[PDB]
Amino acid sequence: AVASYDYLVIGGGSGGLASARRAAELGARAAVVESHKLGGTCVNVGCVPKKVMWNTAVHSEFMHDHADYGFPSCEGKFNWRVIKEKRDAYVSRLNAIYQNNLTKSHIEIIRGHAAFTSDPKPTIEVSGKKYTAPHILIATGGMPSTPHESQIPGASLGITSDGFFQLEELPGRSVIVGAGYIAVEMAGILSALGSKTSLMIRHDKVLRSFDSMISTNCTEELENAGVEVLKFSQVKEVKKTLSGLEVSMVTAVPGRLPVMTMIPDVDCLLWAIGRVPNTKDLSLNKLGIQTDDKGHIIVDEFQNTNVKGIYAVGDVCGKALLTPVAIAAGRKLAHRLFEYKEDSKLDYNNIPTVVFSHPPIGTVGLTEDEAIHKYGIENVKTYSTSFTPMYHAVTKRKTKCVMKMVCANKEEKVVGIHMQGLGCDEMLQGFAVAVKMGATKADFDNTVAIHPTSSEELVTLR
Amino acid sequence: AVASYDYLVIGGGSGGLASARRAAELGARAAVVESHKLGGTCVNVGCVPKKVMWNTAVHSEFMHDHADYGFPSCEGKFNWRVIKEKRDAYVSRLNAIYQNNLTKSHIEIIRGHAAFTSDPKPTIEVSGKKYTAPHILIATGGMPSTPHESQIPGASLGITSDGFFQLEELPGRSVIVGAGYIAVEMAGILSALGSKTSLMIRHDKVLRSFDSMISTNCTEELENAGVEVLKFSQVKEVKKTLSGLEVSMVTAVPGRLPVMTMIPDVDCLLWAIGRVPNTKDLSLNKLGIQTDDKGHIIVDEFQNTNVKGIYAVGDVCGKALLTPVAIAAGRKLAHRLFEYKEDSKLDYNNIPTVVFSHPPIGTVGLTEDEAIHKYGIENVKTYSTSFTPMYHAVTKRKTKCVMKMVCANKEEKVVGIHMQGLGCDEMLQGFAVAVKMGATKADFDNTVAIHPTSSEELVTLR
Numbered sequence A, B: 001a002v003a004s005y006d007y008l009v010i011g012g013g014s015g016g017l018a019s020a021r022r023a024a025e026l027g028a029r030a031a032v033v034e035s036h037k038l039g040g041t042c043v044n045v046g047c048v049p050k051k052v053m054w055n056t057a058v059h060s061e062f063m064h065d066h067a068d069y070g071f072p073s074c075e076g077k078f079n080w081r082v083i084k085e086k087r088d089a090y091v092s093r094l095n096a097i098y099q100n101n102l103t104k105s106h107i108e109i110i111r112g113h114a115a116f117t118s119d120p121k122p123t124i125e126v127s128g129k130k131y132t133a134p135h136i137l138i139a140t141g142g143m144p145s146t147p148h149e150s151q152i153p154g155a156s157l158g159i160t161s162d163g164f165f166q167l168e169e170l171p172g173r174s175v176i177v178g179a180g181y182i183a184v185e186m187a188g189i190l191s192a193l194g195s196k197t198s199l200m201i202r203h204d205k206v207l208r209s210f211d212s213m214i215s216t217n218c219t220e221e222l223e224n225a226g227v228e229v230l231k232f233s234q235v236k237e238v239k240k241t242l243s244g245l246e247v248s249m250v251t252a253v254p255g256r257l258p259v260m261t262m263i264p265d266v267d268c269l270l271w272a273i274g275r276v277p278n279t280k281d282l283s284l285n286k287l288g289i290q291t292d293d294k295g296h297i298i299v300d301e302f303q304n305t306n307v308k309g310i311y312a313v314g315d316v317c318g319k320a321l322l323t324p325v326a327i328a329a330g331r332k333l334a335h336r337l338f339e340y341k342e343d344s345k346l347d348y349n350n351i352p353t354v355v356f357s358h359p360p361i362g363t364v365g366l367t368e369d370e371a372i373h374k375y376g377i378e379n380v381k382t383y384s385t386s387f388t389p390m391y392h393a394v395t396k397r398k399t400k401c402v403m404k405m406v407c408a409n410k411e412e413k414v415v416g417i418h419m420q421g422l423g424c425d426e427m428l429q430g431f432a433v434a435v436k437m438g439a440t441k442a443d444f445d446n447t448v449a450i451h452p453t454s455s456e457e458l459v460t461l462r
């Protein structure tokens, strides 16, 4: 027998939870299928525990400036286990909250792994029971990528971000491989907390898809903070030794000859090279649901799959892999399906991002190079500044703040904002609202500054 | 003999410096008269040294959460002199920078006290030499208010914010009198750094001209932080004792009888009750320049005095006593006079403010009560939230974040934003740009959130 619902959601992470809760508000009879822990990647092995560890890493820098600010320094060591336990308890509190959010909304929780059946009417099976609905959302997320053994023998001796959140002790020596925001964030946390840390990157700079100013500055701040950035470098092999792992690296700097280097006595090797969508065991083939070669579910601008009555949102689609994007796409879909708003969809332009580096990065809109491509070089003007935040006026340790505003056409429409510096994590949201509204530079310059702040520098560029 | 300029600016603080520099960019032959230190109140006894001391007071709270974040605590004491010396050096660096800014712009620096003469053509005298121009800006600022002895015998035993910045040691016991942002800020700094601190206020709450939510929350956070808030209380007399000062207080709570209390062994009594404009010795009468009963120079919307060719900006006019306001009004005036832009003026609506409390406050636009008065009760809707920032998910000490959005008319135009919480100091500027642009709630809700942050809560209110 087959139980019918108005809305069946596969995955109880950011996007699935948000979509199911909004549908239920509109009257849908909904169910969420979850094989592991409610809250998905964000709550369990993502945004939330990452941010707790970032706040911890900030405590390591307050510690270094304490004498400069008039206090006698602290001179004793970090205890990873203390914060690990507290972090785990917070995750458990959130798991209980999201279970209650579904129950309070009268959303059924189906525990187990869903896969599609070959029934012509779209139907899933979970633990040998069948469920159907006229609307089925796939919101199954992704997972970390690890190299194949055939490519990098010994790769399985490394961990990913998932294993990072299982660590019970600070690794003495860490090597992080990759050059995106997860690699950056994990390297910065491990180094701030006292691991002897290297970040191994294929080119000269991290965050190369970000504005060139951010890519440069982020790389410089990593080095200034004590992270060893191993440029033009790749792992060839990993071996277990008596003292941890030995990582065999090849370095090939332009203008130089390639060189092989062994990195001995590594405690933690962390692969932060990408994410793979979680679709292998969904039986998508049984209904002919379209994927790319990497397993991402293909969707249109309304989150429709190629099969009527089946949708997908969030990381499983491979576009803009952020919690607020999954949530917004999920809610817009709920209003389309259950409020009959045919034009309800997410705009994927001007989505803001923060990277929790040291100091944090904020960006929204087009890089300078993207703007030149779209508008023409003669129709783009940039304004920028670099300064030392007043926090550091009295400290021996320094960080900088860099900001870039990208403007298009005669009116100087603000089409991109890019920055790194103290406070940039909390500064960006409001500027993103202004950019989404089509703010011009005149709109920024007509807004009176707030002094003394870093944020005022964005409204006083000349 | 009389030297002539295009532009004569009386006072080398925020507004005078900004106005003179912009005029000189437009070709004006300008001079700045300064009797004390370039940079005025902001650089020397205001924004800048206040902010250094606020950053210091934040170091006192990182210290209290260090064990919770896995570090062994710091257990030794603050040394006021360390940071005082560093703070003074930074002020000296800024004095040298602003002198150079004028010199590099070919702006003459006239050192001494200016007063108007009785010459029918507006002319000032400084150290017995006369100067004239077709455009004279009065930008002389203000000074702290202290009670008259006739009113409060012994009031002169107290200090003001000026004396705060001369303190060479942390006072053991401090009593701050007043209920505005300076009183709040000074009480919070002194208490965080270890002074046994009381804040004496005439009514039940601080910041009563701010939105009611902020007034309430700020008072609660002061008390939670250990500041003793002495409500419905006023100073009657101050006496020198063997052990500091004795403050005689009268307390008169509604519903209760008045009571007199002596507060013994006070080391620092700080008056933070208002500001008086710096106009007493300008000889304004010699030209009939109009003032109010408190000595403020009266101006129109274009900063004109009642006398042709004479202007005033900044604190001397008594309206919106902030550094960015003096600067913006000064620059808009320079473009009016020297770029002939007859409509160039400052809009005094939607000026954003931050109060450096613990945690900081940010506000822009109308309070809920101001919006109801302007638009009608049936045409105002508020949205609000209160939460604990994720920073405190793992700490025993707590602070809250409260946010209020005030919306007008069917379209829900955002006419006010009010908040207190970690990060609110850097969060506000961008939201102020959106409000100045006429953002609606739909504009906020159409902007994708940044997670995990406090700032995302302002774009996800329901």
Ligand SMILES: Cc1cc2nc3c(=O)[nH]c(=O)nc-3n(C[C@H](O)[C@H](O)[C@H](O)COP(=O)(O)OP(=O)(O)OC[C@H]3O[C@@H](n4cnc5c(N)ncnc54)[C@H](O)[C@@H]3O)c2cc1C
Pocket (backbone or CB within 6 Å): A010, A011, A012, A013, A014, A015, A016, A033, A034, A035, A036, A037, A038, A039, A040, A041, A042, A043, A045, A046, A047, A050, A112, A113, A114, A115, A139, A140, A141, A142, A161, A182, A278, A281, A282, A313, A314, A315, A316, A321, A322, A323, A324, A326, B450, B451, B452
């Ligand atoms: C280390 C790290 C840090 C990050 N930091 C941030 C950050 O600061 N900010 C930000 O915005 N984003 C961040 N992200 C990204 C964010 O976590 C993801 O974009 C977001 O979780 C994706 O949500 P989702 O709904 O697509 O998938 P997920 O949250 O991954 O949820 C998918 C759910 O589906 C369940 N599932 C899968 N297959 C099945 C099946 N067949 N049957 C039943 N259940 C199934 C899974 O168990 C899971 O709970 C971070 C991610 C990582 C890994």
Ligand SMILES: Cc1cc2nc3c(=O)[nH]c(=O)nc-3n(C[C@H](O)[C@H](O)[C@H](O)COP(=O)(O)OP(=O)(O)OC[C@H]3O[C@@H](n4cnc5c(N)ncnc54)[C@H](O)[C@@H]3O)c2cc1C
Pocket (backbone or CB within 6 Å): A450, A451, A452, B010, B011, B012, B013, B014, B015, B016, B033, B034, B035, B036, B037, B038, B039, B040, B041, B042, B043, B045, B046, B047, B050, B112, B113, B114, B115, B139, B140, B141, B142, B161, B182, B278, B281, B282, B313, B314, B315, B316, B321, B322, B323, B324, B326
């Ligand atoms: C404790 C405190 C904290 C503050 N915190 C902030 C803050 O965080 N943010 C913010 O925006 N604002 C803050 N302010 C307010 C800010 O300092 C003032 O709004 C701003 O300095 C006013 O600028 P102004 O140009 O009007 O006057 P001022 O900067 O006061 O400059 C006037 C100048 O005129 C000179 N002068 C006066 N009379 C004469 C004369 N006849 N001849 C020659 N020279 C003369 C004075 O010596 C002085 O240098 C703070 C103020 C105080 C007191």
Ligand SMILES: NC(=O)C1=CN([C@@H]2O[C@H](COP(=O)(O)OP(=O)(O)OC[C@H]3O[C@@H](n4cnc5c(N)ncnc54)[C@H](OP(=O)(O)O)[C@@H]3O)[C@@H](O)[C@H]2O)C=CC1
Pocket (backbone or CB within 6 Å): A177, A178, A179, A180, A181, A182, A201, A202, A203, A205, A206, A207, A208, A209, A210, A211, A272, A273, A274, A275, A319, A320, A321, A322, A353, A363, A364, A365
């Ligand atoms: N400007 C913006 O607004 C941007 C926002 N983002 C946001 O961040 C999300 C995640 O992006 P991002 O952090 O770039 O993600 P990635 O998962 O793509 O980052 C991993 C990076 O590591 C490198 N890498 C890939 N494979 C290997 C390998 N086999 N060995 C070593 N290194 C490898 C690549 O960088 P390299 O080529 O340098 O080696 C790659 O970009 C996006 O989906 C988007 O939401 C991302 C980019 C820009």
Ligand SMILES: NC(=O)C1=CN([C@@H]2O[C@H](COP(=O)(O)OP(=O)(O)OC[C@H]3O[C@@H](n4cnc5c(N)ncnc54)[C@H](OP(=O)(O)O)[C@@H]3O)[C@@H](O)[C@H]2O)C=CC1
Pocket (backbone or CB within 6 Å): B177, B178, B179, B180, B181, B182, B201, B202, B203, B205, B206, B207, B208, B209, B210, B211, B272, B273, B274, B275, B319, B320, B321, B322, B353, B363, B364, B365
């Ligand atoms: N909502 C907004 O946007 C607001 C912004 N601001 C900004 O802040 C600037 C400064 O304002 P604010 O901090 O209010 O300034 P004030 O200098 O006016 O604050 C001093 C306060 O102390 C109290 N006080 C006055 N005289 C006495 C006395 N004799 N004894 C004891 N207490 C006394 C009063 O409060 P009480 O009546 O409670 O006793 C008074 O408001 C403004 O010019 C503006 O730029 C100010 C208000 C609102």
Ligand SMILES: N[C@@H](CCC(=O)N[C@@H](CSSC[C@H](NC(=O)CC[C@H](N)C(=O)O)C(=O)NCC(=O)O)C(=O)NCC(=O)O)C(=O)O
Pocket (backbone or CB within 6 Å): A387, A388, A389, A390, A391, A449, A451, A452, A453, A454, A456, A457, A460, B013, B014, B015, B017, B018, B019, B021, B039, B042, B043, B048, B094, B097, B323, B324, B327
């Ligand atoms: N704001 C950042 C950076 C620190 C910073 O601002 N430091 C400068 C001194 S600030 S105090 C004097 C005041 N300046 C302002 O209010 C900023 C004006 C803004 N730049 C603008 O263009 O509107 C003032 O009196 N200005 C009058 C004038 O600008 O003419 C500074 O000088 N830095 C230079 C240095 O080398 O230190 C933060 O707070 O971190």
Ligand SMILES: N[C@@H](CCC(=O)N[C@@H](CSSC[C@H](NC(=O)CC[C@H](N)C(=O)O)C(=O)NCC(=O)O)C(=O)NCC(=O)O)C(=O)O
Pocket (backbone or CB within 6 Å): A013, A014, A015, A017, A018, A019, A021, A039, A042, A043, A048, A094, A097, A323, A324, A327, B387, B388, B389, B390, B391, B449, B451, B452, B453, B454, B456, B457, B460
């Ligand atoms: N953001 C502040 C406050 C801390 C906070 O957000 N805590 C909550 C858990 S966040 S992780 C799960 C994620 N939630 C979000 O991305 C926020 C969505 C936002 N509220 C919105 O409405 O868009 C998610 O999976 N959400 C899916 C869903 O919302 O359905 C939390 O639960 N707090 C409650 C508590 O009692 O702790 C900060 O970062 O400080």
